Design an enzyme around this catalytic site. Structure first.
Site, PDB file in Angstrom:
ATOM      1  N   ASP A 156       0.881  -1.055  -0.063  1.00 26.66           N
ATOM      2  CA  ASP A 156      -0.213   0.281  -0.573  1.00 26.66           C
ATOM      3  C   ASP A 156       0.813   1.102  -0.174  1.00 26.66           C
ATOM      4  O   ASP A 156       1.940   1.242   0.902  1.00 26.66           O
ATOM      5  CB  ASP A 156      -0.854   0.320   1.457  1.00 26.66           C
ATOM      6  CG  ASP A 156      -2.181   0.645   1.064  1.00 26.66           C
ATOM      7  OD1 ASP A 156      -2.257   1.339   0.543  1.00 26.66           O
ATOM      8  OD2 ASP A 156      -3.017   0.580   1.636  1.00 26.66           O
TER       9      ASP A 156
ATOM     10  N   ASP B 187      -1.760  10.246   5.256  1.00 24.40           N
ATOM     11  CA  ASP B 187      -1.826   8.677   6.226  1.00 24.40           C
ATOM     12  C   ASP B 187      -1.008   9.041   7.300  1.00 24.40           C
ATOM     13  O   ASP B 187      -1.237   8.461   8.456  1.00 24.40           O
ATOM     14  CB  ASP B 187      -1.456   7.190   5.825  1.00 24.40           C
ATOM     15  CG  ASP B 187      -2.637   7.101   4.318  1.00 24.40           C
ATOM     16  OD1 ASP B 187      -3.345   6.518   5.317  1.00 24.40           O
ATOM     17  OD2 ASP B 187      -1.978   6.622   3.595  1.00 24.40           O
TER      18      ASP B 187
ATOM     19  N   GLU C 144      -3.645   0.131  10.839  1.00 20.53           N
ATOM     20  CA  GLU C 144      -3.109  -0.475   9.557  1.00 20.53           C
ATOM     21  C   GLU C 144      -1.630   0.459   8.914  1.00 20.53           C
ATOM     22  O   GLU C 144      -0.823  -0.313   8.194  1.00 20.53           O
ATOM     23  CB  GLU C 144      -3.687   0.811   8.662  1.00 20.53           C
ATOM     24  CG  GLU C 144      -3.863   0.086   6.797  1.00 20.53           C
ATOM     25  CD  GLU C 144      -4.283   0.947   5.842  1.00 20.53           C
ATOM     26  OE1 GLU C 144      -3.353   0.597   4.918  1.00 20.53           O
ATOM     27  OE2 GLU C 144      -5.239   2.134   6.313  1.00 20.53           O
ATOM     28  N   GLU C 145      -1.080   1.206   9.528  1.00 23.62           N
ATOM     29  CA  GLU C 145       0.210   2.145   8.920  1.00 23.62           C
ATOM     30  C   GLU C 145       1.398   1.252  10.043  1.00 23.62           C
ATOM     31  O   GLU C 145       2.592   1.826   9.337  1.00 23.62           O
ATOM     32  CB  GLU C 145       0.286   3.292   9.251  1.00 23.62           C
ATOM     33  CG  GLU C 145      -1.626   4.021   8.956  1.00 23.62           C
ATOM     34  CD  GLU C 145      -0.573   3.526   7.398  1.00 23.62           C
ATOM     35  OE1 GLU C 145      -0.062   3.845   6.318  1.00 23.62           O
ATOM     36  OE2 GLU C 145      -1.522   3.836   6.236  1.00 23.62           O
TER      37      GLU C 145
ATOM     38  N   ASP D 132      -8.111   2.377  11.930  1.00 21.86           N
ATOM     39  CA  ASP D 132      -7.112   3.158  10.576  1.00 21.86           C
ATOM     40  C   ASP D 132      -7.231   4.242   9.733  1.00 21.86           C
ATOM     41  O   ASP D 132      -8.313   4.692  10.968  1.00 21.86           O
ATOM     42  CB  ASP D 132      -8.604   2.045   9.312  1.00 21.86           C
ATOM     43  CG  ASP D 132      -8.049   2.545   7.760  1.00 21.86           C
ATOM     44  OD1 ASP D 132      -8.941   2.319   6.894  1.00 21.86           O
ATOM     45  OD2 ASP D 132      -6.544   3.337   7.855  1.00 21.86           O
TER      46      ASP D 132
ATOM     47  N   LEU E 206      -6.760   7.423   8.929  1.00 24.81           N
ATOM     48  CA  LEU E 206      -7.866   7.604   7.776  1.00 24.81           C
ATOM     49  C   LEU E 206      -7.970   6.076   6.265  1.00 24.81           C
ATOM     50  O   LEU E 206      -6.750   5.439   5.535  1.00 24.81           O
ATOM     51  CB  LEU E 206      -6.547   8.127   6.699  1.00 24.81           C
ATOM     52  CG  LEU E 206      -6.855   9.336   5.739  1.00 24.81           C
ATOM     53  CD1 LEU E 206      -7.817  10.010   6.426  1.00 24.81           C
ATOM     54  CD2 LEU E 206      -5.965  10.434   5.011  1.00 24.81           C
ATOM     55  N   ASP E 207      -9.195   6.210   6.080  1.00 25.06           N
ATOM     56  CA  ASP E 207     -10.054   4.944   5.025  1.00 25.06           C
ATOM     57  C   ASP E 207     -10.504   5.955   4.094  1.00 25.06           C
ATOM     58  O   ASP E 207     -10.802   7.231   3.978  1.00 25.06           O
ATOM     59  CB  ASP E 207     -10.588   4.379   6.242  1.00 25.06           C
ATOM     60  CG  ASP E 207     -11.984   3.528   5.472  1.00 25.06           C
ATOM     61  OD1 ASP E 207     -11.438   2.724   4.300  1.00 25.06           O
ATOM     62  OD2 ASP E 207     -12.684   3.834   4.120  1.00 25.06           O
TER      63      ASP E 207
ATOM     64  N   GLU F 205     -10.692  -2.266   9.867  1.00 30.59           N
ATOM     65  CA  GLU F 205     -12.031  -1.926   8.641  1.00 30.59           C
ATOM     66  C   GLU F 205     -13.292  -2.837   9.081  1.00 30.59           C
ATOM     67  O   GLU F 205     -14.578  -2.836   9.315  1.00 30.59           O
ATOM     68  CB  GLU F 205     -11.130  -2.263   7.254  1.00 30.59           C
ATOM     69  CG  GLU F 205     -10.359  -1.686   6.665  1.00 30.59           C
ATOM     70  CD  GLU F 205      -9.105  -1.590   5.622  1.00 30.59           C
ATOM     71  OE1 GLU F 205      -9.563  -0.170   5.167  1.00 30.59           O
ATOM     72  OE2 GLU F 205      -9.052  -2.520   5.089  1.00 30.59           O
TER      73      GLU F 205
HETATM   74  O1  LIG Z   1     -10.598   0.726  -5.394  1.00 30.62           O
HETATM   75  P1  LIG Z   1     -11.360  -0.857  -4.758  1.00 30.62           P
HETATM   76  O2  LIG Z   1     -10.228  -1.973  -5.009  1.00 30.62           O
HETATM   77  O3  LIG Z   1     -12.744  -0.382  -4.959  1.00 30.62           O
HETATM   78  O4  LIG Z   1     -11.155  -0.766  -3.540  1.00 30.62           O
HETATM   79  C1  LIG Z   1     -11.711   0.815  -2.734  1.00 30.62           C
HETATM   80  C2  LIG Z   1     -11.807  -0.063  -0.875  1.00 30.62           C
HETATM   81  O5  LIG Z   1     -10.424  -0.260  -0.190  1.00 30.62           O
HETATM   82  C3  LIG Z   1     -10.130   0.701   0.281  1.00 30.62           C
HETATM   83  O6  LIG Z   1      -9.862   2.024   0.405  1.00 30.62           O
HETATM   84  C4  LIG Z   1      -9.332   0.171   1.570  1.00 30.62           C
HETATM   85  O7  LIG Z   1      -9.157   1.259   2.258  1.00 30.62           O
HETATM   86  C5  LIG Z   1     -11.475   0.570   1.292  1.00 30.62           C
HETATM   87  O8  LIG Z   1     -11.968   2.405   1.921  1.00 30.62           O
HETATM   88  C6  LIG Z   1     -12.680   0.867  -0.041  1.00 30.62           C
HETATM   89  O9  LIG Z   1     -14.059   0.501   0.345  1.00 30.62           O
HETATM   90 MG   LIG Z   2      -9.346   1.558   5.116  1.00 28.39          MG
HETATM   91 MG   LIG Z   3      -5.160   3.757   6.134  1.00 24.28          MG
HETATM   92 TL   LIG Z   4      -5.608   6.994   2.990  1.00 26.00          TL
HETATM   93 TL   LIG Z   5      -7.598  -2.657   3.061  1.00 34.19          TL
HETATM   94 TL   LIG Z   6      -2.317   2.535   3.671  1.00 33.94          TL
HETATM   95 TL   LIG Z   7      -5.662  -1.329   4.198  1.00 29.70          TL
END
Ligand SMILES: O=P(O)(O)OC[C@H]1O[C@](O)(CO)[C@@H](O)[C@@H]1O
Ligand SMILES: [Mg+2]
Ligand SMILES: [Mg+2]
Ligand SMILES: [Tl+]
Ligand SMILES: [Tl+]
Ligand SMILES: [Tl+]
Ligand SMILES: [Tl+]
Length: 331
Positions: free
Chosen positions: A62, A68, A91-92, A112, A114-115, A274
């Site tokens: 990642d 982040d 996560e980090e 996480d 920052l998601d 998550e």
């Molecule tokens: O680009 P993709 O494969 O749909 O991934 C989106 C998913 O990945 C993430 O960024 C993982 O952190 C989620 O927030 C999100 O639901």
């Molecule tokens: Mg996330």
């Molecule tokens: Mg994150």
């Molecule tokens: Tl992020």
């Molecule tokens: Tl993820």
């Molecule tokens: Tl990350």
């Molecule tokens: Tl992740």
């Protein structure tokens, strides 16, 4: 007006009759501080030059963004300073973080910071996800304290940096939503005892993976688009940020899917920080959360960075998809 039902007040009164050391209030008050500081950076990230990468990669793979690093530092520092925690999983960070003896409290927090990483630079909704466990063991705190099943959660939720900033918090009796008032820097209760609809009319999945989907997901999606009973087809929504798609699922109903596929036996999303937090929110809201074959909250993790497939939302929609998995199930 002059009687603000803040997140603090709510969680203090909640933990009143139930007694308690009051470190959960301490924890959440602390978390709220990092969430405000993340919200303020996010809301002016372009001006403060906070877009772009940090120059590093996460565990399995990642690309780490600047926000982040910032959000990770803020959450860890405030949690440590809260005197409510002993083990932190982020996560980090490749390994669990053990809090120093002097600042140790009884909780284990997985988060996480920052998601929605792919949505940072285009200003789409992003968020923060957390799940909190009581340490059970009596031995020295360690990474294993974080390897509990989701059903052992005492609290979980997320902050959503969307059109407004919202803190969604789930605990044993239910789910409540608090909106950040940017004028006074307080989370105020705006939605009480949230419950998800039994059946929704939105499906949320990245159909870019159609080529890799298992036959059950493939069948389900075809059914949303061509209903056999002549009902109207479901609308599709996929913001691309788990916190945004899950929040919409909660307040509008429907289903969110990040399933296993031919290239990813365990899906993509991470179980500890998550999938478990969102599954817990959903279940406390009267919703369901499955891998397709088992409840996400019942999985016993063996890796803090473990992945899991997840399908969640309105019970009748999630059930419909489970029925398809069951129908397809083989030796
Ligand atoms: O680009 P993709 O494969 O749909 O991934 C989106 C998913 O990945 C993430 O960024 C993982 O952190 C989620 O927030 C999100 O639901
Ligand atoms: Mg996330
Ligand atoms: Mg994150
Ligand atoms: Tl992020
Ligand atoms: Tl993820
Ligand atoms: Tl990350
Ligand atoms: Tl992740």
């Amino acid at each position: 007006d002059t009687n603000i039902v803040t997140l603090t007040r709510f969680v203090m009164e909640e933990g009143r009759k139930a007694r308690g050391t009051g470190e959960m209030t301490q924890l959440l008050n602390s978390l709220c501080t990092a969430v405000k500081a993340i919200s303020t950076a996010v809301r002016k990230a372009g001006i403060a030059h906070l877009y772009g990468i940090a120059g590093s990669t996460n565990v399995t793979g990642d690309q780490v963004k600047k926000l982040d690093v910032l959000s990770n530092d803020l959450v860890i520092n405030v949690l440590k300073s809260s005197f409510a925690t002993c083990v932190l999983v982020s996560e980090e960070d490749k390994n669990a973080i053990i809090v120093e003896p002097e600042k140790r409290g009884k909780y284990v927090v997985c988060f996480d910071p920052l998601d929605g990483s792919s949505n940072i630079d285009c200003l789409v909704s992003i968020g923060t996800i957390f799940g909190i466990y009581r340490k059970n063991s009596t031995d020295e705190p360690s990474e294993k304290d974080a390897l509990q099943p989701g059903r052992n959660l005492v609290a979980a939720g997320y902050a959503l940096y969307g059109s407004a900033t919202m803190l969604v918090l789930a605990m044993v009796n239910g789910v409540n939503c608090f909106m950040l008032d940017p004028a006074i820097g307080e989370f105020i209760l705006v939605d009480r005892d949230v419950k998800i609809k039994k059946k929704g009319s939105i499906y949320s999945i990245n159909e870019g993976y159609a080529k890799e989907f298992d036959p059950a997901i493939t069948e389900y999606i075809q059914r949303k688009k061509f209903p056999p009973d002549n009902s109207a087809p479901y609308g599709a929504r996929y913001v691309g940020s788990m916190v945004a798609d899950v929040h919409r699922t909660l307040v509008y109903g429907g289903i969110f899917m990040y399933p296993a596929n031919k290239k990813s036996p365990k899906g993509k999303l991470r179980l500890l920080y998550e999938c478990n937090p969102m599954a817990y929110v959903m279940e406390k809201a009267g919703g369901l959360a499955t891998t397709g074959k088992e409840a996400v909250l019942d999985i016993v993790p063996t890796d803090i960075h473990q992945r899991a497939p997840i399908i969640l939302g309105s019970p009748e929609d999630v059930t419909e998809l489970l029925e398809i998995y069951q129908k397809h199930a083989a030796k």
